[PDB]
Structure 1
């Protein structure tokens, strides 16, 4: 009675992986390589479509990670190679205009540097932070001398994140989850289709996520497996917490040639008092923020469980401190004042000051062999940013006791991406299909 009928243009799809390209809208995200965005993007709501999403198996995150690494390397590749700099340094402490915190923190080094002419040498003196310099035996070397070569970042290229929109190729589409309070691993009752993602700023940080999206309704706790003590917890905040970071010291930047066409930048001197870099977090706002986080953690851990916050257990600064790029400088802030409380049964203009260290020799993305020198920046630096989420680890104490402990985590950049790319998945469009009908083909 019934016959096979072939249809083309059928609105169906399959989970799929493909390569996405950037659309943008003097940086390290090749925004000049990217195409421009669509001024009028078309978001189509799909009525009566329930789609299952899994943010932990989302390969968009893996593709973003790789793209960021490659873009980074390409922007650095053509810049000055500071191999003439791995020399014996003669260093003493800065004692003039020093406060108590900056005691032995900053060092005054001198060395024999090359010049344009192969035949000549110059004696250069620069200030360095103690984190960049390691003692040889007053004889010091830079920390990278026994593991890597240094490339000076180009002074003309910024490190300020520029939103990146990822776009699917024709034949593919990106499904977006609009379900508020979506925990990122589950069926999503309300979805829409987009061709490009919203603009995601590739902000790099460790313990606290900065300048991301806010939760629509309430703090959202997400993890790959909540009962697994080995997993990280991503917390998306409902309201931002404003954090004010600064390096008060007025740096005078000097530049010399170290070979034909090769300019090296260094801190020459500091004008006035030498003080420690720091970040200020409103005390009241931070206290409200944690109370909200605790109420939500209890949905998984119970009322009878005490929720305790504690500082990181230890390791390299890159995993024990809050790292970020502020004004182009690299800060390592100790967030102990933010995670030092016990909440039992959920129990002005004050502020929390976090001391920060400054480091010029940078080893990003947890790689070995590619090290960067961050030129110093002339003048005084201040930046203001939003804390939009936290990364926490868990010591599973409640198994044996009444108290559970959470500590700042992070350090794996993929988890910072997952923060924004949890609403999206890539699907392939499959326009062909068949179904029985009453229709037959005349011969």
Structure 2
């Protein structure tokens, strides 16, 4: 009766959820190269009036995409460097005692061994220092820890892994939508959507227990989880103020280069210059014991105004789980965080010792090991704690006192909080509608 006909339109502003490959883009570092295409210096962020969309940070393929690419890049940049297979020999070791402080006793070992020279038919006696974490006893015979499980390679002493903020950008035909609501918590509709060409800069920082160098929420400390109720799930906490942490490795180190083949050099840790001290991190007591008060108030929102909130130490397991894995300056620290989670909250300078390790299983895989060459001199790091990874045990439904503990994580979780506001969609420009025109 209406006599309407199908009219075809092309260029219709309609889109559907999609999963594609984002291409990277920055502004001797590995991310200096794998993010060359410069971002626009003035990204074209477009506010969309009257657009509401559903977001889900726990099902975000951008998180998965970053994870795959960080690992893939990592193992490509180290591909051409010298293998340390020849170092997997029987070592003769003793304790380092020369000016070692009492707190470090037995931590370092002085090992001598028979290793080849550049000529196939000649050997040399060399020695180097190792941290005890990487040396396994076989009266003085020791083995490197990776020898019964994996191949060990030397990280290229030229390749930098200092985090670089990187941006993800959409390919043609795609767009990245950003959630700009306030107090968005993981999932559900976000009645404030803006379209961008690229994400903000995100640093590919790797850590456990404490989240470092991210965005500081916006208004208030926020608690997010896939489930909350199910204690098997993690709770991510994002701070609205940084807690500054100062970490150091005080020993003044030197290096020696040992030929292990024709054009193949091994970097060994030499004698420590001066007094030998323990690595550690400083957290301001008066900032931490205030920042947690904000976390506690937000937890009561879900756990009860009259409940008891307790922060306990970490649980059992290996260093990668029970300690704070901290990568800084090029060295790997394993810090003891028990001094940060020791309190009971009711309704009404902190020093963390650290260990240093050189043989690192960078990703939880079997068959590879990375040797981190030592850094000359001393190192000091300054960083922003921007959040927590917490787990929960009990209370709630039984008898008060929910216990929260710092936990480990899946790597992804450290990026999940920054990729949090973004979703990838594809544009579908064709569509039809009834009109009054006929050819």
CA deviation vs aligned residue, 1:233-286 (integer Å, no higher than 9, x gap): 010100000000000100111111100111111111101111100000000000
Offset of residue 397 of structure 1: 2.4
Local SS of the residue matching 1:84: helix
CA deviation vs aligned residue, 1:34-73 (integer Å, no higher than 9, x gap): 3221112100000110111001111111111000000000
Flag the 1:56–1:167 CA change in 2: closer, same or farther, 3 A: same
**Aligned residues of 2:328 and 2:381 also touching (Cα < 8 A):** yes
Offset of residue 32 of structure 1: 4.7
Offset of residue 119 of structure 1: 1.1
Flag the 1:30–1:151 CA change in 2: closer, same or farther, 3 A: farther
Offset of residue 367 of structure 1: 1.1
**Aligned residues of 1:29 and 1:68 also touching (Cα < 8 A):** no
Moved more, 384-393 or 396-405: 396-405
User: Equivalent residue for 2:142?
Assistant: 140
Offset of residue 350 of structure 1: 25
**Aligned residues of 2:26 and 2:32 also touching (Cα < 8 A):** no
**Aligned residues of 1:29 and 1:72 also touching (Cα < 8 A):** no
**Aligned residues of 2:27 and 2:38 also touching (Cα < 8 A):** yes
**Aligned residues of 1:30 and 1:71 also touching (Cα < 8 A):** no
| 1:414 corresponds to 2:416 | no
Equivalent residue for 1:399, pick from 397, 400, 403 = 397
Local SS of the residue matching 1:296: helix
**Contiguous gaps of at least 5 residues in structure 1:** none
Offset of residue 2 of structure 1: 1.5
Q: Distance in 2 between matches of 1:305 and 1:26?
A: 52
**Aligned residues of 1:115 and 1:258 also touching (Cα < 8 A):** yes
Local SS of the residue matching 2:69: helix
Equivalent residue for 2:276, pick from 270, 274, 277 = 274
Local SS of the residue matching 1:56: helix
**Aligned residues of 1:280 and 1:353 also touching (Cα < 8 A):** yes
Query: If the length of structure 2 is used for normalisation, what is the TM-score?
Result: 0.97
**Aligned residues of 1:360 and 1:373 also touching (Cα < 8 A):** yes
CA deviation vs aligned residue, 1:267-313 (integer Å, no higher than 9, x gap): 11101111100000000000110000000011110112100001111
Q: Distance in 2 between matches of 1:355 and 1:182?
A: 36
Query: If the length of structure 1 is used for normalisation, what is the TM-score?
Result: 0.96
* Dislocated runs of 4+, deviation >3 Å: none
**Aligned residues of 1:318 and 1:411 also touching (Cα < 8 A):** no
CA deviation vs aligned residue, 1:163-210 (integer Å, no higher than 9, x gap): 111111110000001112111211111110011111111001111011
**Aligned residues of 2:389 and 2:409 also touching (Cα < 8 A):** no
Flag the 1:384–1:33 CA change in 2: closer, same or farther, 3 A: closer
**Aligned residues of 2:152 and 2:369 also touching (Cα < 8 A):** yes
Flag the 1:367–1:350 CA change in 2: closer, same or farther, 3 A: farther
CA deviation vs aligned residue, 1:78-125 (integer Å, no higher than 9, x gap): 111000000000111111111121011111100001111111111111
Q: Distance in 1 between matches of 2:172 and 2:135?
A: 52
Offset of residue 326 of structure 1: 1.3
Local SS of the residue matching 1:272: coil
Equivalent residue for 1:107, pick from 109, 117, 137 = 109
User: Equivalent residue for 1:69?
Assistant: 71
User: Equivalent residue for 2:287?
Assistant: 285
Local SS of the residue matching 2:296: helix
**Contiguous gaps of at least 5 residues in structure 2:** none
Number of aligned residue pairs: 436
Local SS of the residue matching 2:104: coil
**Aligned residues of 2:35 and 2:166 also touching (Cα < 8 A):** no
Offset of residue 398 of structure 1: 2.3
Q: Distance in 2 between matches of 1:242 and 1:204?
A: 17
